[PDB]
Amino acid sequence: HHAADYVLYKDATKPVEDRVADLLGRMTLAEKIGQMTQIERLVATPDVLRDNFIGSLLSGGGSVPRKGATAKEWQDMVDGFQKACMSTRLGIPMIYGIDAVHGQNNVYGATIFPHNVGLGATRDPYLVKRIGEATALEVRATGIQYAFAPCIAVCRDPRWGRCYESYSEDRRIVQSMTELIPGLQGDVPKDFTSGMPFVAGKNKVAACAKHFVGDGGTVDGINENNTIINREGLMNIHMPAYKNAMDKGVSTVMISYSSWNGVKMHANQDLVTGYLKDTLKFKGFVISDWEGIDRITTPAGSDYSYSVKASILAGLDMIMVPNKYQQFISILTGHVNGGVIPMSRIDDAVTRILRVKFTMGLFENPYADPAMAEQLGKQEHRDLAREAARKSLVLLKNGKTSTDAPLLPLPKKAPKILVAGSHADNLGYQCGGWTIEWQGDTGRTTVGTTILEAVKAAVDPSTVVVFAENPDAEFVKSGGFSYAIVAVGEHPYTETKGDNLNLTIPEPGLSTVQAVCGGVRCATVLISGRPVVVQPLLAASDALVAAWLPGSEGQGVTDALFGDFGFTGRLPRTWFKSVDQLPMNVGDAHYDPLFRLGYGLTTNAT
Numbered sequence: 001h002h003a004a005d006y007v008l009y010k011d012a013t014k015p016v017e018d019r020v021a022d023l024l025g026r027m028t029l030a031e032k033i034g035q036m037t038q039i040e041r042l043v044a045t046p047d048v049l050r051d052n053f054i055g056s057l058l059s060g061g062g063s064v065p066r067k068g069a070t071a072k073e074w075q076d077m078v079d080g081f082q083k084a085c086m087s088t089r090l091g092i093p094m095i096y097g098i099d100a101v102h103g104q105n106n107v108y109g110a111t112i113f114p115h116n117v118g119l120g121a122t123r124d125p126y127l128v129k130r131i132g133e134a135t136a137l138e139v140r141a142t143g144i145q146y147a148f149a150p151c152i153a154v155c156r157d158p159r160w161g162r163c164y165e166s167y168s169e170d171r172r173i174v175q176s177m178t179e180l181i182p183g184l185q186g187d188v189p190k191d192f193t194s195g196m197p198f199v200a201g202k203n204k205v206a207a208c209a210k211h212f213v214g215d216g217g218t219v220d221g222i223n224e225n226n227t228i229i230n231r232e233g234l235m236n237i238h239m240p241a242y243k244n245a246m247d248k249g250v251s252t253v254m255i256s257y258s259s260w261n262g263v264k265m266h267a268n269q270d271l272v273t274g275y276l277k278d279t280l281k282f283k284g285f286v287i288s289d290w291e292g293i294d295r296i297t298t299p300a301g302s303d304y305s306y307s308v309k310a311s312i313l314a315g316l317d318m319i320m321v322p323n324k325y326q327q328f329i330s331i332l333t334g335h336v337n338g339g340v341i342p343m344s345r346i347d348d349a350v351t352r353i354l355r356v357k358f359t360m361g362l363f364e365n366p367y368a369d370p371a372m373a374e375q376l377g378k379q380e381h382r383d384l385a386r387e388a389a390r391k392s393l394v395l396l397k398n399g400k401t402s403t404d405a406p407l408l409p410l411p412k413k414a415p416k417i418l419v420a421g422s423h424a425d426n427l428g429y430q431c432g433g434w435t436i437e438w439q440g441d442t443g444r445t446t447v448g449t450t451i452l453e454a455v456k457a458a459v460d461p462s463t464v465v466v467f468a469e470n471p472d473a474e475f476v477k478s479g480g481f482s483y484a485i486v487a488v489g490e491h492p493y494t495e496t497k498g499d500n501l502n503l504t505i506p507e508p509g510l511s512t513v514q515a516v517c518g519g520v521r522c523a524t525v526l527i528s529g530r531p532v533v534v535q536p537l538l539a540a541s542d543a544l545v546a547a548w549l550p551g552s553e554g555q556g557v558t559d560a561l562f563g564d565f566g567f568t569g570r571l572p573r574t575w576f577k578s579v580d581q582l583p584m585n586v587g588d589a590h591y592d593p594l595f596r597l598g599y600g601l602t603t604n605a606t
């Protein structure tokens, strides 16, 4: 279709499938295996990318070009890598992935939205869609084209360190929140075939339904462990939201470290190929988790040859290596040369990777848009995160007795008030894990507003605000306070560090709540990724709010505490009486909750 040097795959007017086939037919085995290889930016260089024909890069949690980097620094980094990939013989652009799981959360100055458990509490799929839309803009602000979200785990045991990444223990709520996907990627057209990948263009990102499948079903909530459940239960609880994801054109699916009835998901051909590809008709690409193939074996990494064989034969398309790419490529090349993995399997993998790249426009826009840098941390998106944080709050108690005056809403005008607790003025704590660092961090780690700052921004000018992190009982009684707001809870964690058999908050939290509430009427704000042992906090407090991990916009919290809006959030999970009850789910025989799924008190805006 015209000039003498015409190449069909480079022609933006051609159908995606024609472009995929034209490119695939030209590729060497080295070029094919390169597309299947995703590496960390920490090990990437221009020569490595060109020489190994690398298909993808990622930043893991905390993998950043430098601390405090601007949106422009991220774009320049990603473009540097892209320039090397575009300089290969065939000029196939790489796709760069990152965990933008509550906003573009590795990036300094990005808006940080509430984590998924709090979004489940909103029962507002359209809010979640809008969060996906804003997240895509802030990811593209940094030049990145692919987010490893949503996590559609159905957490069935809150002792799991990733329970906060699950919208709900109720699969119906998780299915509803798959609206994140068309927010991140754009709405699919009228015609759309379920299972096809979709991204609208350069202002949207490829998404990733993860982690397939039953990651939220593991024994005792042990992260990466075994999910012991029959097929009916797997299909009724853990699978349904994957189908909604196919219907919404999710571009990629990431496999789980977990096992199902003792079979590693990363080696499960029946589920990855038999079910996801052949039954759900998924036509995007399947990516491993990080060293996911290594962890098929015990010990992990003890037979990397088998890891490669088992995962590629199971049907995985792209491997998040992410560091030992020379070994990965060498082993896989050996398997193909030896006939152990057929060329048909390689060609399927590359067909799916190329299909996503062409569909999303990556060959037409391989480089970042400098005009998008200013989308990072935009006030409109902070206003959305503030709405979301407010809607996520669940009011658990509002007066010690049913005849006391309701404590909330609090008045904005009072002579003197106390703000207290380890979580009242700690932006890192209020964001939780997957914020700036992999495991999150403590203190002022990014741009945002802590609960204390939000209180100071809300109250009348005549209201004197005193902050004390851990006041003793006498300080409070002698202080002439009208009321206190005390915020306590979990410290940030991610993945196995978050697995927790006791679910009791760190001290001094309960002691601070008891000291404060013993001296003046108090509203306790509990920051956590999950239900935690709460009876002692409830007993001490006039009012108690479960605020989950509300993100950078602490004014979401004070918007409800001071009655600008009423409380509307409802528990998206069961609140247990004791960890000895666990697992305990709405439907079980011994179902004896402290607060059932769907519980939440309300207030009216003042």
Ligand SMILES: *[C@@H]1O[C@H](CO)[C@@H](O)[C@H](O)[C@H]1NC(C)=O
Residues within 6 Å of the ligand: 222, 224, 225, 226, 259, 262
């Ligand atoms: C589950 O955890 C136990 C204890 O750490 C471990 O030894 C076992 O291998 C794990 N099982 C799976 C399927 O990961």
Ligand SMILES: *[C@@H]1O[C@H](CO)[C@@H](O)[C@H](O)[C@H]1NC(C)=O
Residues within 6 Å of the ligand: 498, 499, 500, 501, 502, 503, 504
């Ligand atoms: C509760 O579990 C957490 C994480 O496993 C731990 O850090 C804390 O000290 C535990 N308390 C116990 C085991 O008594």
Ligand SMILES: *[C@@H]1O[C@H](CO)[C@@H](O)[C@H](O)[C@H]1NC(C)=O
Residues within 6 Å of the ligand: 603, 604
């Ligand atoms: C909030 O509003 C409605 C009136 O529309 C009422 O039924 C509910 O009890 C109200 N509660 C309070 C405390 O005003």
Ligand SMILES: OC[C@H]1O[C@@H](O)[C@H](O)[C@@H](O)[C@@H]1O
Residues within 6 Å of the ligand: 059, 060, 061, 062, 063, 290, 438
């Ligand atoms: O899977 C474990 C890895 O996850 C990645 O997101 C992080 O960047 C690494 O620090 C961590 O070791």
Ligand SMILES: OC[C@H]1O[C@@H](O)[C@H](O)[C@@H](O)[C@@H]1O
Residues within 6 Å of the ligand: 059, 060, 061, 099, 148, 210, 289, 290, 495
């Ligand atoms: O950062 C890359 C990956 O790290 C792994 O540790 C997590 O399990 C994935 O959810 C994440 O996408």
